[PDB]
Amino acid sequence: HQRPELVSFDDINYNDHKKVREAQESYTREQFIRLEALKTVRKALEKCYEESGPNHFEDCKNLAEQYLDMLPTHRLQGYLGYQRNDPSK
Amino acid sequence: AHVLTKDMIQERIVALLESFDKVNDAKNITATANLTSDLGLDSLDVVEVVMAIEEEFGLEIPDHDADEIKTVQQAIDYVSAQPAA
Amino acid sequence: PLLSQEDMKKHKILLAYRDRCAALLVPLNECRKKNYYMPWACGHERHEYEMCEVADFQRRVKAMDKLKAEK
Amino acid sequence: GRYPFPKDVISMTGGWWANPSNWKLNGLFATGIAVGLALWVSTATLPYTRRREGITSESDISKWNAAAGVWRERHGKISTGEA
Amino acid sequence: NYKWNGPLPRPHVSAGHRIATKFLGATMFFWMFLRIKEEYPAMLGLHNFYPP
Amino acid sequence: ILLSSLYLFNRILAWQGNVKHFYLFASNLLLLFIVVLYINFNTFSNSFQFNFELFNSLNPFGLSNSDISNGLLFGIDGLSLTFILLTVLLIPLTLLGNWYNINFNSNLYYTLVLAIGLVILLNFWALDYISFYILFEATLPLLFILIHIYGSSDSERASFYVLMFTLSGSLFMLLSIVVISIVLNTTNFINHNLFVLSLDLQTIIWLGLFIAIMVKTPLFPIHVWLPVVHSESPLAGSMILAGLILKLALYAILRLLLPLLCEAQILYTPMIYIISLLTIILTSLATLRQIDLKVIIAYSSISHMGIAILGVCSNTSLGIYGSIVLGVAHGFVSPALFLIVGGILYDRYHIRIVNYYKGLTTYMPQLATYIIILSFANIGTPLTGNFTGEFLSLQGGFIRNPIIGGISCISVLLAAIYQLKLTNKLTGGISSIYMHRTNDVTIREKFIMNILIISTLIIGICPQIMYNLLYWTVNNYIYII
Amino acid sequence: IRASFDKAEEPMLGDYPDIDPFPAQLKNPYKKYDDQQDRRNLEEPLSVNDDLYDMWSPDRFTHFKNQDALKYFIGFLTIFFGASYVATYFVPEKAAIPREFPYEGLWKESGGTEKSKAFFGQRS
Ligand SMILES: CCCCCCCCCCCCCCCCCC(=O)OC[C@H](COP(=O)(O)OCCN)OC(=O)CCCCCCCCCCCCCCCCC
C-alpha cells in the first residue's frame, strides 16, 4: 500500500516538474481522503436511521447535522485554483 | 368459430324481407326478385331495407354501394363478398 | 399513566402516537404482533385504546366549546 | 382462424403460431436451465442478504452520535433553527 | 340458429357455470349480511363520541 | 520489420488484389496492441506515460534522445487512453461495414478509411498544440476525397461542406495557437497549466479556440453542415464522423482550453451555456420536420453533443465524467444507427426518404428489434451508457447554473419525441407498397450491431468501470479556490 | 393553401405544385387506395407541408371547432375552480380542538433543541 510524500504548492519552484506533479497529486489525494471521511459519516448516519426508526430525529441528530455540514466542503475542488493563485497576496 | 354459407345468407335475407310489412307479397320474393319492381318498394323503403340488412349481418354499407344493389341476388352476392359479416 | 420518555423511545412508538394514551398502545401493538394483525384478534386491547382516544377527543371538544364560548 | 405466412421469415420469437414438433424435449431443456439459473442466483446472492434492524448495537450508534457532537463542537456548529 | 325473427330458445349454460354463479352470489350476499350484522352500530353511525 | 512488413503487404496485394483483408488484420492487431498498452498503463499517476518525440533535429527520422525538444511530442494519460480505446474498437467495424457494397476502385476506398482512422488515433496521442493541430487538419482532404468519390447523389456539395466549414473554424483555432506560440514560446500540454496569461489576453485566445470548437462539435448556429455531410457520406465516413471525429472537439475542450485559459473560461461559461441550450432545444425541434433517415440520425448527434458540452463546461467532477461517458456511449450507439439507416436499409433499397418506409416488422423482425433497441438506447434509457452520460452531464449543468440545467432537462422528452416518431413509423403499420421484400439483417450486420449494443450495455450497467482511467481527469480541470 | 403556414411557403415554391392540403384522416375510408392504410394513391401530388396532413400526423377532431373546444375546456376549469374557491367561504367550523402532545409538543423527539423549539415542536 503506497503512501507518497505530501508536497505543497507554496514550497516548490514551478520549474521542477517532478515537484509540481507531486503537489498536484497530493492535493487531489487529500481531497479524496476528505470524500472518504464524508462517506464514513453518511454510512454511520444510514445505520443510525435504520436502527432508530421513529426516534432517529433524536438519536441521529449529530450525524445528520454533521453530514449536512460536511457536504459543501468535502467534495472535489481541483488543484488549479490553488496552484494558479497565491492566497497571501 | 362461426362461418356463414351462401344459403344461410339467402335464408336470412328472405326471412328479413318476409318480416317487412310494406312489401306487396311474401310468396313472390325470389333470389332474383327486384325490390323496386316486383316487390314495389319505394325509394326510401329500399333504403330502410339496406339498413336492415346491415343491422342484421353487422356490416357497414357505403352510400355508393348501397344504392347499387337493386335485386336480392345482388344483395346476397354483396353480403357474401364481405369477409367479416 | 403518561409513559416515560425512555419508555416511549424503548418501545419505538411513532411520534404522532406519543400521547397520554400510548401506554395502552404498547400492549395493543404487542398483541397485533403476536397475532398476525388479524381482525378477529386483539379485541380487548384495541377497544381499550379506542376508549382512551374517546376520552382525549372528548376533552378536546370541551376545549373547543370553551374557546367558542369566549367569543 | 389462421392464414398463410411467409416461411422464410425467421424470428427469435418463433413467428406465426410457433409450435415446434419437438417442443416437449426442448421444454425439458429450458426448464432445467431455468431451475439451475434460479438456484444459482438464490444461493450466490445469499451472502449479500441482511436484515435491516438489529445489525449494529446501541453502543456503536450512541458513540457515533457522541463523536459527531464532538466534531460539531470542535468546529463552531449551532443547530438548525438555533439562532 | 334455426329460428330467425322469432322467439329465442332458453340459453344452454353449463352446469358448472350455474353452480359457480350460485356459489359466488350466495357467498357475496351472505358475507354482506354477516358484515352488516357485525358492524351495524359503527357502520350506520351510533354512540356519538361527543359528551352529552 | 518495416521492410519485411512492406514486402508482406506488396505480395498480398500482388496475389489477392484486394487490400481489405490486410487492412482488417492490421487494425485488429492495432486494437490488441492498445489493449496490451492498457495492461501496462499505471493508473496511480497523473503523468503522461508512453512518450515519444518525432522529427527532432538530432534524429529527424527516429525517436529523440536529445536534451533539446524541438520535434513533435506524443504521449498518453488516462483521458487520451479512453478515446484511443474507443477509436481502435471502432476502426475494424468501419472496415467491416462496407465489406460488400464497395465494388469499383475498392482498394482506394479502404485505404482512405484506414488512413482517416489512423490519423484520428494519432491525434489522440498528440502532446502539443502544433502536433494536435496538424493531425486535426489532416483528416479534411481524406474526407473530401472519400465523400466526393464514394458518396451518394449530392456528395460534391457534401465534400465541399466538410472541407470548407472545418477549415473555417480551424483557421481561427490557428490564430489562437499562433498567439500562444509567440507569447509563451512553448506549445506542449505537459506544463501549460503553469503559464498564467493576463486575463485580457486569455479572453482573446479563448475566442479563437471556441470558434473552432463551435464548428467542430458542432453547436448552434454553425451546425448546418453536419446533416448534409452525414447524409451524403458513404457508410464508413458517417461512422467515423459521428463516432470519432465529433469527440475530438470534446477532447479539445479538455486538453487545449481548460488547463490554459481557466479564468477566461470562468468568465465565458454563461455564454457557453446559452449556446448549448440553444443547440439542444432548437436542433431537437428541427429534427421533427425531417424526411431523410440519415439526416434525422445526424441531427440527433448534435443535441447529444450539446448535452455533453453542458457537462464538460460545468466546473464539476460529475459533469466532466458525464461528458466523457456520454461521448463514449454516443460513439457506440450513433454508428449503429447510421449502420441501420445508411448501411442496411440503403443497401437494400437505395433511398432515404421517410415516406417510402413503413411496417418493416413483418418481413424483417430482427431488424425491427435492432431498431427498437438502438432507439431506446439513443434516447437515454437507463442501463445504457447514454443515460449515465446524460444524467451526469445534466447534474453538473444544473449545479453550474440551476435555471439553465433545469431547462436543459427537457432534452429527455425532445429526444424521445424525434427518435420514437421515426421508429414508430419504421416498425409499425402494414408493409410498405413501394418496396419489395428483401433479406433480413445478415450475419455481418448483426455482428457489428451486437458489438455496439454490448459495449453500450456494459458501460450502462457499470459506468464505474471507466473510473480507473479517469479519476485524475475529473479533478484535473475544475477551477475552485 | 388553407392554413397560414402553408400560405407562408407560397413565395418558397417556384415550379412546385401549389397543392390544397386535406388531412388524410378525413378522406373517406371506403374509397379504394393503392395504400389503404395511408389512404394515398400512387403518384398523387404532395403538399409542401404534407408531413402535417398524412395519416401519421396528429389526430384531428371534427365535432367541435378548435376555438369552441377551447372555450369549453377553459370554461370547465373556470367553473370548477371558482366554485370550489367560493365554497371555501361557506364552511362549517369544527367541533374538537386539534390534538396536543406532552413535552411542549415533543420538540425533543422531533430533533429540536432548547434554543430552537419553534422550528421543531408540536402544539403542546
Ligand atoms: C500525414 C499526417 C501528419 C503526419 C505527422 C505525424 C506522422 C507520424 C508517423 C506515425 C509514426 C508514429 C507511430 C510510431 C512512433 C512510435 C514508435 C515508438 O517506439 O514509440 C516510442 C515509445 C517509447 O519507446 P522507447 O522510449 O524506445 O522505450 C521502449 C521500451 N521497450 O513507445 C511507445 O510507447 C509506443 C507508442 C505507441 C503509439 C501508438 C501509435 C498509434 C498509431 C501508429 C501508426 C499511425 C500511422 C498514422 C498514419 C497516418 C498519418 C497520420
Short mmCIF file of N, CA and C in Angstrom, two decimals, chain C residues 2-5 8-9 15-16 18-19 53 57 60-61 63-64 67-68, chain G residues 93-103 106 108-111 122 124:
data_model
loop_
_atom_site.label_atom_id
_atom_site.label_comp_id
_atom_site.label_asym_id
_atom_site.label_seq_id
_atom_site.Cartn_x
_atom_site.Cartn_y
_atom_site.Cartn_z
N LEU C 2 -48.98 8.55 32.01
CA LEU C 2 -48.16 9.01 30.90
C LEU C 2 -46.82 8.28 30.88
N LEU C 3 -46.43 7.79 29.71
CA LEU C 3 -45.25 6.96 29.60
C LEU C 3 -43.97 7.78 29.74
N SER C 4 -42.93 7.12 30.23
CA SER C 4 -41.62 7.74 30.29
C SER C 4 -41.10 8.03 28.89
N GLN C 5 -40.34 9.12 28.77
CA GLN C 5 -39.63 9.39 27.53
C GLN C 5 -38.74 8.21 27.15
N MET C 8 -41.11 5.49 26.00
CA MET C 8 -41.62 5.80 24.67
C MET C 8 -40.58 5.47 23.61
N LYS C 9 -39.33 5.88 23.83
CA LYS C 9 -38.27 5.56 22.89
C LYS C 9 -38.01 4.06 22.83
N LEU C 15 -44.17 9.03 16.39
CA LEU C 15 -44.30 10.32 17.05
C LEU C 15 -45.76 10.74 17.19
N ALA C 16 -46.55 10.59 16.13
CA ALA C 16 -47.94 11.01 16.19
C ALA C 16 -48.78 10.17 17.14
N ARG C 18 -47.51 9.28 20.18
CA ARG C 18 -46.96 9.53 21.52
C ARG C 18 -47.84 10.53 22.24
N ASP C 19 -48.83 10.03 22.97
CA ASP C 19 -49.84 10.84 23.62
C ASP C 19 -49.95 10.40 25.07
N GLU C 53 -58.74 7.04 23.43
CA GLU C 53 -58.88 8.07 22.42
C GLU C 53 -60.23 8.78 22.53
N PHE C 57 -60.47 12.82 22.78
CA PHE C 57 -61.28 13.60 21.85
C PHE C 57 -62.38 14.37 22.57
N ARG C 60 -60.91 17.43 24.09
CA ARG C 60 -60.68 18.44 23.06
C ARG C 60 -61.97 19.11 22.59
N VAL C 61 -63.08 18.37 22.51
CA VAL C 61 -64.33 19.02 22.11
C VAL C 61 -64.81 19.97 23.19
N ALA C 63 -62.73 21.59 25.14
CA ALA C 63 -61.82 22.72 24.95
C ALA C 63 -62.33 23.65 23.86
N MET C 64 -62.75 23.08 22.73
CA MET C 64 -63.27 23.90 21.65
C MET C 64 -64.55 24.60 22.07
N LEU C 67 -63.50 27.60 24.14
CA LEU C 67 -62.95 28.61 23.24
C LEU C 67 -64.05 29.31 22.46
N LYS C 68 -65.04 28.55 21.98
CA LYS C 68 -66.19 29.14 21.30
C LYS C 68 -66.94 30.09 22.23
N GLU G 93 -67.62 25.28 10.98
CA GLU G 93 -66.47 25.21 11.87
C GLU G 93 -66.43 23.87 12.58
N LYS G 94 -65.22 23.42 12.89
CA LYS G 94 -65.05 22.13 13.54
C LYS G 94 -65.49 22.22 15.00
N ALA G 95 -65.57 21.05 15.64
CA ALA G 95 -66.12 20.95 16.98
C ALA G 95 -65.11 20.54 18.03
N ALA G 96 -64.01 19.89 17.65
CA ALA G 96 -62.98 19.48 18.59
C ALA G 96 -61.70 20.26 18.33
N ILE G 97 -60.93 20.47 19.39
CA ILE G 97 -59.66 21.17 19.28
C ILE G 97 -58.65 20.24 18.63
N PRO G 98 -57.74 20.76 17.80
CA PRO G 98 -56.65 19.92 17.30
C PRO G 98 -55.83 19.38 18.46
N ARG G 99 -55.38 18.14 18.33
CA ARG G 99 -54.81 17.48 19.49
C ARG G 99 -53.44 18.04 19.83
N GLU G 100 -52.95 17.64 21.00
CA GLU G 100 -51.73 18.18 21.56
C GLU G 100 -50.90 17.05 22.14
N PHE G 101 -49.69 17.40 22.58
CA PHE G 101 -48.68 16.40 22.85
C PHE G 101 -47.82 16.82 24.03
N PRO G 102 -47.42 15.89 24.88
CA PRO G 102 -46.59 16.24 26.04
C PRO G 102 -45.22 16.75 25.62
N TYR G 103 -44.50 17.27 26.61
CA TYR G 103 -43.16 17.82 26.42
C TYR G 103 -43.15 18.93 25.38
N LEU G 106 -43.36 17.59 22.08
CA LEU G 106 -42.35 16.58 21.72
C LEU G 106 -41.26 17.18 20.85
N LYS G 108 -38.27 17.69 21.49
CA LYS G 108 -37.05 16.90 21.58
C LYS G 108 -37.14 15.65 20.70
N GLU G 109 -38.32 15.04 20.62
CA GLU G 109 -38.45 13.80 19.87
C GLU G 109 -38.35 14.03 18.37
N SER G 110 -38.78 15.20 17.91
CA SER G 110 -38.64 15.60 16.51
C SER G 110 -37.35 16.40 16.30
N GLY G 111 -36.23 15.85 16.76
CA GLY G 111 -35.00 16.60 16.79
C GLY G 111 -35.12 17.72 17.80
N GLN G 122 -44.50 20.45 18.56
CA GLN G 122 -45.90 20.31 18.21
C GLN G 122 -46.74 21.34 18.96
N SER G 124 -48.34 21.13 21.69
CA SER G 124 -48.18 21.11 23.14
C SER G 124 -49.51 21.16 23.89
#
